[PDB]
Amino acid sequence: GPSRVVYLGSIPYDQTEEQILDLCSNVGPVINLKMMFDPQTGRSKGYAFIEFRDLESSASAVRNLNGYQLGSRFLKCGYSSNSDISG
* CA-to-CA separations, 51 to 5, 11, 42, 55, in angstroms, rounded: 4, 17, 23, 10
Q: Using CB under 5 A, pick the residue from 9, 21, 66, 70 that binds Mg ion.
A: 9
Q: Using CB under 5 A, pick the residue from 46, 51, 60, 70 that binds Mg ion.
A: 46
Q: Using CB under 5 A, pick the residue from 47, 49, 68, 79 that binds Mg ion.
A: 47
Q: How wide is the angle at C-alpha 7 spanned by C-alphas 6 and 8, nearest 5°?
A: 115
**Least distance from C-beta 5 to Mg ion, angstroms?**
17
Applying the rule CB under 5 A, the residues between 48 and 87 that interact with Mg ion are none
Q: Which of 53, 2, 1 is nearest to 24 (CA)?
A: 53
Binding site for Mg ion (CB under 5 A): 9-10, 46-47
